[PDB]
């Protein structure tokens, strides 16, 4: 459907976010995992904004419609 | 390569695990996110064992080789 | 008050849980952090059950009333 | 001892951080839990810097010496 949850993950260098986990890979890189919930369209747009940022690599969005 | 990190995510109902996050979706379902690190082969085998379990659905493994 | 959030943390070896994080300290010990929300009385009882378990050490409950 | 792990938790509005979890309480407040590891002195200083920030409330540091 259009409503559900999603997992956005990416490596670095809003009422949509349920929880976000930051895990350090090394001195320069942080692995970030964000659990999102709401309208899948708003979820995609959130991921869009994140992936558009410099320093953000390997962005992946796993959608989980209800 | 063969060594790096990985993000295994799945909905429910080892020295490989760096951190695991459990988030409740509702009364019956828990979204689980596991951050793994080590040999990508051991990582895949870990995911294999998890996905083979009854009650585990929508399993996804995102690999991040160094 | 009686309703709010709480952080239960402990070292190892329900609709109350919002999210739980497991972090490995070493081969034998896992640091677990549980974010709880609901009636502070139910929260305390949840922590009670966890701390009563063998293998669970250094249990600490930080309450955050609304 | 002086080396070990620690859990720093606080409500909002480095090679020391192992993992950090952000959980939304509501529109304005985010509950943040940081798992730290290293010299307990460096850990305390990290917590000091965080708690000194405006908007940061209910800061608590649970130390876990090895
Ligand atoms: Zn981060
Ligand atoms: Zn980082
Ligand atoms: Zn779970
Ligand atoms: Zn669950
Ligand atoms: Zn655990
Ligand atoms: Zn463990
Ligand atoms: Zn936060
Ligand atoms: Zn926040």
Short mmCIF file of C-alpha atoms and ligand atoms in Angstrom, two decimals:
data_model
loop_
_atom_site.label_atom_id
_atom_site.label_comp_id
_atom_site.label_asym_id
_atom_site.label_seq_id
_atom_site.Cartn_x
_atom_site.Cartn_y
_atom_site.Cartn_z
CA UNK A 1 0.00 0.00 0.00
CA UNK A 2 1.01 3.61 0.61
CA UNK A 3 1.38 3.40 4.40
CA UNK A 4 3.85 1.23 6.27
CA UNK A 5 7.46 1.17 7.44
CA UNK A 6 10.82 1.41 5.70
CA UNK A 7 14.51 0.95 6.44
CA UNK A 8 16.87 3.48 4.93
CA UNK A 9 20.56 2.60 5.26
CA UNK A 10 23.65 4.46 4.06
CA UNK A 11 27.28 5.23 4.82
CA UNK A 12 28.16 8.80 5.79
CA UNK A 13 31.49 10.34 4.78
CA UNK A 14 10.77 14.80 11.13
CA UNK A 15 7.92 12.74 12.59
CA UNK A 16 8.72 10.25 9.84
CA UNK A 17 11.72 8.85 11.71
CA UNK A 18 10.85 6.21 14.30
CA UNK A 19 14.43 5.47 15.29
CA UNK A 20 17.87 6.03 13.81
CA UNK A 21 20.98 4.03 14.56
CA UNK A 22 24.50 5.32 13.97
CA UNK A 23 27.30 2.77 13.98
CA UNK A 24 30.93 3.66 13.47
CA UNK A 25 32.78 1.72 10.78
CA UNK A 26 36.07 3.57 11.24
CA UNK A 27 37.61 7.02 11.78
CA UNK A 28 35.91 8.45 8.68
CA UNK A 29 32.77 6.41 8.02
CA UNK A 30 29.52 6.04 9.95
CA UNK A 31 26.88 3.50 8.96
CA UNK A 32 23.43 5.00 9.54
CA UNK A 33 20.18 3.05 9.65
CA UNK A 34 16.90 4.93 9.82
CA UNK A 35 13.56 3.26 10.50
CA UNK A 36 10.79 5.29 8.93
CA UNK A 37 7.02 5.06 9.11
CA UNK A 38 4.21 6.87 7.36
CA UNK A 39 3.12 7.42 3.78
CA UNK A 40 5.46 5.52 1.45
CA UNK A 41 5.56 8.61 -0.74
CA UNK A 42 6.81 10.77 2.11
CA UNK A 43 9.24 7.99 2.97
CA UNK A 44 10.71 7.97 -0.54
CA UNK A 45 11.04 11.76 -0.48
CA UNK A 46 12.87 11.56 2.84
CA UNK A 47 15.32 9.03 1.37
CA UNK A 48 15.66 11.27 -1.69
CA UNK A 49 16.80 14.20 0.44
CA UNK A 50 19.29 12.05 2.36
CA UNK A 51 20.87 10.45 -0.72
CA UNK A 52 21.20 13.85 -2.42
CA UNK A 53 23.71 14.87 0.27
CA UNK A 54 27.43 14.87 -0.46
CA UNK A 55 29.34 12.35 1.61
CA UNK A 56 26.35 9.99 1.65
CA UNK A 57 27.11 6.73 -0.17
CA UNK A 58 25.52 3.31 -0.71
CA UNK A 59 22.05 4.53 0.14
CA UNK A 60 19.41 1.82 0.16
CA UNK A 61 15.73 1.98 0.95
CA UNK A 62 13.82 -1.15 1.89
CA UNK A 63 10.07 -0.54 1.90
CA UNK A 64 7.63 -2.53 4.03
CA UNK A 65 4.02 -1.70 3.10
CA UNK A 66 1.45 -2.73 5.71
CA UNK B 1 36.06 -7.66 -1.33
CA UNK B 2 35.34 -10.46 1.14
CA UNK B 3 35.62 -8.40 4.33
CA UNK B 4 33.41 -5.49 5.30
CA UNK B 5 30.05 -4.70 6.88
CA UNK B 6 26.46 -5.61 6.10
CA UNK B 7 22.94 -4.68 7.14
CA UNK B 8 20.47 -7.51 7.50
CA UNK B 9 16.86 -6.41 7.99
CA UNK B 10 13.70 -8.48 8.40
CA UNK B 11 10.29 -8.61 10.06
CA UNK B 12 9.75 -11.20 12.78
CA UNK B 13 6.37 -12.89 13.25
CA UNK B 14 28.06 -14.60 17.29
CA UNK B 15 31.02 -12.22 17.05
CA UNK B 16 29.65 -11.37 13.61
CA UNK B 17 26.96 -9.10 15.04
CA UNK B 18 28.13 -5.56 15.81
CA UNK B 19 24.75 -4.27 16.91
CA UNK B 20 21.14 -5.33 16.51
CA UNK B 21 18.12 -3.08 16.70
CA UNK B 22 14.61 -4.33 17.44
CA UNK B 23 11.74 -1.98 16.68
CA UNK B 24 8.12 -2.84 17.31
CA UNK B 25 5.75 -2.38 14.37
CA UNK B 26 2.67 -3.62 16.25
CA UNK B 27 1.41 -6.29 18.66
CA UNK B 28 2.61 -9.13 16.43
CA UNK B 29 5.49 -7.82 14.31
CA UNK B 30 9.00 -6.70 15.23
CA UNK B 31 11.32 -5.10 12.68
CA UNK B 32 14.88 -6.28 13.31
CA UNK B 33 18.01 -4.67 11.89
CA UNK B 34 21.36 -6.37 12.39
CA UNK B 35 24.68 -4.74 11.58
CA UNK B 36 27.23 -7.40 10.75
CA UNK B 37 30.96 -7.29 10.14
CA UNK B 38 33.51 -9.85 9.06
CA UNK B 39 33.98 -12.13 6.08
CA UNK B 40 31.19 -11.51 3.56
CA UNK B 41 30.85 -15.27 3.22
CA UNK B 42 30.22 -15.70 6.93
CA UNK B 43 27.85 -12.74 6.72
CA UNK B 44 25.80 -14.38 3.96
CA UNK B 45 25.65 -17.63 5.93
CA UNK B 46 24.42 -15.75 8.99
CA UNK B 47 21.64 -14.16 6.91
CA UNK B 48 20.88 -17.59 5.45
CA UNK B 49 20.26 -19.04 8.91
CA UNK B 50 18.04 -16.12 9.92
CA UNK B 51 15.88 -16.16 6.78
CA UNK B 52 15.42 -19.94 7.05
CA UNK B 53 13.46 -19.40 10.29
CA UNK B 54 9.67 -19.59 10.30
CA UNK B 55 8.04 -16.29 11.16
CA UNK B 56 10.87 -14.35 9.52
CA UNK B 57 9.67 -12.37 6.50
CA UNK B 58 10.98 -9.73 4.09
CA UNK B 59 14.60 -10.53 4.82
CA UNK B 60 17.07 -8.28 3.04
CA UNK B 61 20.84 -8.20 3.16
CA UNK B 62 22.74 -5.10 2.11
CA UNK B 63 26.46 -5.81 1.77
CA UNK B 64 29.13 -3.14 2.19
CA UNK B 65 32.57 -4.48 1.19
CA UNK B 66 35.50 -2.43 2.47
CA UNK C 1 3.90 11.56 36.35
CA UNK C 2 2.96 7.93 35.74
CA UNK C 3 3.22 7.97 31.94
CA UNK C 4 6.36 8.64 29.94
CA UNK C 5 9.47 6.92 28.62
CA UNK C 6 12.34 5.02 30.22
CA UNK C 7 15.73 3.59 29.32
CA UNK C 8 16.58 0.21 30.76
CA UNK C 9 20.20 -0.86 30.26
CA UNK C 10 22.01 -4.02 31.35
CA UNK C 11 24.75 -6.49 30.45
CA UNK C 12 23.69 -10.00 29.48
CA UNK C 13 25.86 -13.01 30.37
CA UNK C 14 5.41 -6.51 24.94
CA UNK C 15 3.90 -3.30 23.58
CA UNK C 16 5.95 -1.56 26.27
CA UNK C 17 9.16 -1.82 24.26
CA UNK C 18 9.62 0.93 21.67
CA UNK C 19 13.04 -0.19 20.53
CA UNK C 20 15.80 -2.40 21.87
CA UNK C 21 19.47 -2.20 20.97
CA UNK C 22 21.90 -5.08 21.42
CA UNK C 23 25.60 -4.26 21.26
CA UNK C 24 28.33 -6.83 21.63
CA UNK C 25 31.00 -6.10 24.22
CA UNK C 26 32.92 -9.34 23.63
CA UNK C 27 32.51 -13.09 23.07
CA UNK C 28 30.46 -13.52 26.26
CA UNK C 29 28.78 -10.20 27.03
CA UNK C 30 26.07 -8.24 25.23
CA UNK C 31 25.08 -4.74 26.31
CA UNK C 32 21.32 -4.32 25.89
CA UNK C 33 19.47 -1.01 25.89
CA UNK C 34 15.68 -1.01 25.89
CA UNK C 35 13.59 2.10 25.32
CA UNK C 36 10.24 1.70 27.04
CA UNK C 37 7.08 3.78 27.01
CA UNK C 38 3.82 3.58 28.90
CA UNK C 39 2.76 3.61 32.53
CA UNK C 40 5.83 4.06 34.73
CA UNK C 41 4.47 1.31 36.96
CA UNK C 42 4.36 -1.15 34.08
CA UNK C 43 7.81 0.07 33.08
CA UNK C 44 9.25 -0.68 36.53
CA UNK C 45 7.65 -4.14 36.50
CA UNK C 46 9.18 -4.84 33.10
CA UNK C 47 12.63 -3.88 34.44
CA UNK C 48 11.95 -6.02 37.50
CA UNK C 49 11.39 -9.11 35.36
CA UNK C 50 14.53 -8.46 33.32
CA UNK C 51 16.83 -7.89 36.30
CA UNK C 52 15.49 -11.03 38.03
CA UNK C 53 17.05 -13.13 35.24
CA UNK C 54 20.30 -14.99 35.82
CA UNK C 55 23.13 -13.72 33.64
CA UNK C 56 21.71 -10.19 33.70
CA UNK C 57 24.06 -7.76 35.45
CA UNK C 58 24.41 -4.01 36.02
CA UNK C 59 20.75 -3.33 35.33
CA UNK C 60 19.81 0.34 35.40
CA UNK C 61 16.51 2.03 34.76
CA UNK C 62 16.37 5.71 33.87
CA UNK C 63 12.82 7.04 34.02
CA UNK C 64 11.60 10.00 31.98
CA UNK C 65 8.09 11.06 33.06
CA UNK C 66 6.26 13.27 30.55
CA UNK D 1 39.02 0.27 36.07
CA UNK D 2 39.68 3.09 33.60
CA UNK D 3 38.77 1.20 30.42
CA UNK D 4 35.36 -0.22 29.58
CA UNK D 5 31.99 0.78 28.15
CA UNK D 6 29.36 3.34 29.08
CA UNK D 7 25.80 4.30 28.20
CA UNK D 8 25.06 7.99 27.91
CA UNK D 9 21.36 8.83 27.59
CA UNK D 10 19.63 12.20 27.28
CA UNK D 11 16.67 14.03 25.77
CA UNK D 12 17.38 16.57 23.04
CA UNK D 13 15.26 19.73 22.70
CA UNK D 14 34.74 10.48 17.73
CA UNK D 15 36.14 6.94 17.87
CA UNK D 16 34.67 6.84 21.37
CA UNK D 17 31.15 6.22 20.09
CA UNK D 18 30.38 2.58 19.31
CA UNK D 19 26.76 3.16 18.37
CA UNK D 20 24.17 5.86 18.90
CA UNK D 21 20.42 5.41 18.87
CA UNK D 22 17.98 8.25 18.26
CA UNK D 23 14.35 7.63 19.17
CA UNK D 24 11.61 10.18 18.69
CA UNK D 25 9.46 10.93 21.72
CA UNK D 26 7.32 13.55 19.96
CA UNK D 27 7.45 16.52 17.58
CA UNK D 28 10.00 18.36 19.73
CA UNK D 29 11.94 15.77 21.73
CA UNK D 30 14.39 13.06 20.68
CA UNK D 31 15.70 10.50 23.15
CA UNK D 32 19.35 9.76 22.35
CA UNK D 33 21.33 6.80 23.66
CA UNK D 34 25.05 6.62 23.00
CA UNK D 35 27.15 3.54 23.68
CA UNK D 36 30.72 4.57 24.38
CA UNK D 37 33.93 2.61 24.83
CA UNK D 38 37.45 3.55 25.78
CA UNK D 39 39.13 5.27 28.71
CA UNK D 40 36.50 6.09 31.34
CA UNK D 41 38.09 9.52 31.66
CA UNK D 42 37.60 10.24 27.98
CA UNK D 43 34.09 8.85 28.32
CA UNK D 44 33.23 11.26 31.14
CA UNK D 45 34.64 14.18 29.15
CA UNK D 46 32.51 13.19 26.17
CA UNK D 47 29.40 13.17 28.37
CA UNK D 48 30.50 16.51 29.82
CA UNK D 49 30.54 18.11 26.38
CA UNK D 50 27.12 16.69 25.50
CA UNK D 51 25.41 17.77 28.72
CA UNK D 52 26.87 21.28 28.43
CA UNK D 53 24.77 21.81 25.29
CA UNK D 54 21.58 23.86 25.44
CA UNK D 55 18.48 21.82 24.68
CA UNK D 56 20.05 18.71 26.22
CA UNK D 57 18.15 17.56 29.31
CA UNK D 58 18.08 14.59 31.69
CA UNK D 59 21.58 13.50 30.80
CA UNK D 60 22.69 10.29 32.50
CA UNK D 61 25.90 8.36 32.22
CA UNK D 62 26.06 4.71 33.23
CA UNK D 63 29.64 3.47 33.40
CA UNK D 64 30.62 -0.17 32.90
CA UNK D 65 34.30 -0.72 33.74
CA UNK D 66 35.77 -3.95 32.36
ZN1 LIG E 1 26.04 8.67 12.06
ZN1 LIG E 2 29.97 8.70 12.70
ZN1 LIG E 3 12.91 -8.11 17.72
ZN1 LIG E 4 9.16 -7.65 18.96
ZN1 LIG E 5 21.66 -8.77 23.30
ZN1 LIG E 6 25.02 -10.75 22.50
ZN1 LIG E 7 18.37 12.38 18.02
ZN1 LIG E 8 14.83 13.86 16.94
#
